[PDB]
Symmetry: D2
């Protein structure tokens, strides 16, 4: 009863203005741009949205704006996760008020928590979400949390959990999760292995690079559905040429810079301590924006 | 010109009341209790203070209260670190207003930052600290940040840096830091190796377990100064028997529970997602409080 | 000019008798069994062959026996790798004498070696191989060696290197290697991600579980060639149900036990310190052998 | 009843000649040199002895030569460890024949073994050692084996185990081991933390750098016994200046080069794939040899 959550959803970036304040006008334009890429949903306030250098009120502000542009048109998922359970609950209650279709929360980090503490954290947020489903979000590389398969199985069967965001490159585990849970909504988290992650059992994806080239990932979905192995590989090749460059320049600010050159974002800054893009990369990023716009 | 920062300083816990709100009365009593243990300073708003499940305004509130009880009596160090540079600067400016003697900031975490981004982060906070010195705080285990010796050397020679909080069990690196920087204020971060860390080159310590037994760590300092090898080892043995138990029960909540049984804190709760202490451990923690009070 | 090395090749197990001596008769039967599975080659004396609990003379003995059964019928690859360069060269010269088509060597382990020391190690073995090509074998999980993409690129372009055995679950790196080297023979090393690894750029595989079910992996190759996405996934599912069980029971001894129940190996023991299979797993392993024999 | 195993023992290097063959004459001179440094024992055939690039017969040859020079004069410990249990047993039986006072074995590596497989491995070697005690050797950094405290406790209480070689920088665990086992012979393994490791509970050490400056480590033992904190720290400082240089140049070959400049070893080569020392380091290593000889 949550199959409406399956698909390809950009992890929304949060545009900032020249003084590191939220750029509300560019945020609305980014939502509209992603809708017009034909995505299945948007994922708001995640790591990629620079949530962990924003206050709670800033995160709520972003959630409400995105709901204003996109409620009813595409699926809306609110990443409400903080280290604090009480802070996460406040964002879940807000997401509910604004009409989101699901909430999500990263495994709480920095401090070591027991597995039962993780489960109670999710249970508390689910209660505050007041009837909209929860997406468990697994990103061991950044969170430092290293869950076992059996712990993942317990999380995805918690009452109120409707999906798993699997930000892991271990595609044995992806296949095991799919085999244990054939109906589970299972998002591939690393864009650079999207085609292989779908083959291993994911049925969708949440990704930062979908903000600039969602049609490629939709094309990978279509290629594997149609049985065009070689087209899925060629599309993944092109995605990874782009990801190579983004890793070199810095991923969030590279994506925001490409979006600026596509006339989507007025100002491409990340918040400190992220530095601005080095001048020597600007030509490459502008050429990529031009390439991507022509490819459409 | 910052030798006044050397010594043994508890990493202050933040007392909460039964509804997870700050317990201001127990906070003031905890400051007074630590002063009367004869410590050299207190370290406020660190990891141990549960900073990362508090808002900025809550952290400022704690800083100002502690300064009200302790300014002028002992050294005050404010941990102002957040992921965000701008948030860290706000806390540094506040710490300056409240009369702290130093600020400190954990290496920003969750997101990968370049080393130069780390340095600019520290430079920005130092500027907002408006003339009080900075303590670099290294805790690779929890931050995920794995600095090299040469990067540590560049951080401790940044203008405005007066100390290093070395929360690392690598005592080769402790000795290398001391040999490269003979005048550096160098805090041992892991209480469970305090005696060995002093021998390897630290000249003080910042520790969570000093809140319940600072006299033991002061006694280790005195033993090594006097050349009583065996007394330093026996004191460290007793500290580690306590740390063994705290790890079993959960360190912050175990410390708060011992302080409650010493009539220092009215309520020993941590914030969610930390669970309360299991009932089966209460007898041991109360017996430890009684042991520690008699030992004084 | 080494496209004849592409394909699906079992990592041969080394059968031992009841007293931990090589079982020469069961070895010959295992080679013949693998040939009659329609594999493209066999990979002899690797990790899976328990090379690192055998002497050099025992490894040479196995190489020569396998060449006697299989030279001319299928591709033969000799894993000659040791920590010692001189020991590896002896095995390479032997493999050449016995008529192998390629040699392979794991990155030397236990001791830390510089990257240039690794390259000179490969260069020395290539020289002793006396004109047959080298397969670089990357297994960071077991070797502790963590090569970068640029170092991999330098290894696969060493004169005399004809292939890379990529025993890594990082399928971003698999795709990068393929994109940098479109003609490279690129073996997937983890059987549990075979379908996804082929999609990411591998054009074959070397695997321990091919000894008991090579037709499934050949079927995955055929399915992806034909564009039958769902059949590749179903075959991988069945492989991983088997791999799940093998991990539970111990992989090498589980494989040898299944082969014993298929009447291929007389005795299914590994060498100490590998323990024998626990009695409680025997029913499951015998049922799997019966299932696999009927499936053919 | 194994207190005769406590103390400071060099991890003997194995001298090779110009063609990578064992240099028997320089081996005997190295044993004699170490005896005349006043060490408590010698540790033969360990990692430092380049055991894992030698055959079994080469290791036996080294064991027997060292016993010929040193049996009866100082304690002799034979590192018999291999991955194979049967190979380790052969070396243990040989060590017994040659009159060694103890055997030692690294936790078997490369392949994952269960803890019970590790214990049975030690039990088998102890049986072949035929009444001389076993030293468990823990070096997680190089072995990849990450034992828990409770597993260490089970190993050191196996019948026939008389000591633990603790090659770990975790001095919390060192203290826990000492507190659990007050009579255990407990060797510090990382020379660069020797003083701190003794303070944390070790009562001796086995180290590669003792081959060139054992008197410094004996002086650290004496300083801590006498209560001269500052002298132990100054000696450790000087040791670590040397270790810094050895890490830069390559530790085994740097040590052998210093010994060559002290007229102990005729030829300072390691076996391939270890490269020779770079020419640019020779001046520093010769100056260190001259410094060390004058310091005596
Ligand atoms: Cl936040
Ligand atoms: Cl973190
Ligand atoms: Cl905070
Ligand atoms: Cl945070
Ligand atoms: Cl071997
Ligand atoms: Cl290893
Ligand atoms: Cl050996
Ligand atoms: Cl080996
Ligand atoms: Na949708
Ligand atoms: Na003070
Ligand atoms: Na072939
Ligand atoms: Na002795």
């Amino acid at each position: 009863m949550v199959s409406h959550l399956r698909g390809v959803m950009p992890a929304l970036l949060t545009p900032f203005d020249a003084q590191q304040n939220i750029d509300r006008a560019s945020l609305r334009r980014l939502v509209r741009f992603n809708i017009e890429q034909g995505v299945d949903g948007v994922y708001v306030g995640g790591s990629t949205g620079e949530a962990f250098v924003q206050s709670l009120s800033e995160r709520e502000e972003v959630l409400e704006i995105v709901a204003e542009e996109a409620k009813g048109k595409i699926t809306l998922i609110a990443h409400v996760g903080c280290v604090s359970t009480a802070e996460s609950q406040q964002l879940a209650a807000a997401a509910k008020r604004y009409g989101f279709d699901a909430v999500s929360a990263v495994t709480p980090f920095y401090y070591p928590f027991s597995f039962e503490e993780h489960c109670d954290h999710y249970r508390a947020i689910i209660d505050s979400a007041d009837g909209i489903p929860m997406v468990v979000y697994n990103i061991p590389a950044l969170s430092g949390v290293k869950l076992t398969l059996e712990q993942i199985n317990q999380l995805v069967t918690l009452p109120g959990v409707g999906a798993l965001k699997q930000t892991s490159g271990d595609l044995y585990q992806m296949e095991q999760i799919r085999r244990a849970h054939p109906e589970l909504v299972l998002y591939n988290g690393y864009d650079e292995i999207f085609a292989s992650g779908l083959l291993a059992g994911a049925d969708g994806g949440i990704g930062s690079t979908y903000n600039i080239m969602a049609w490629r990932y939709l094309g990978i979905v279509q290629a594997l559905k149609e049985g065009d192995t070689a087209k899925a590989q060629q599309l993944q090749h092109e995605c990874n040429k782009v990801i190579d460059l983004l890793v070199k320049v810095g991923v969030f600010r590279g994506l925001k810079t490409v979006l600026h050159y596509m006339d989507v974002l007025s100002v491409p800054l990340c918040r400190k301590p992220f530095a601005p893009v080095e001048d020597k990369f600007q030509a490459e990023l502008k050429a990529l924006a031009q390439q991507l716009m022509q490819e459409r």
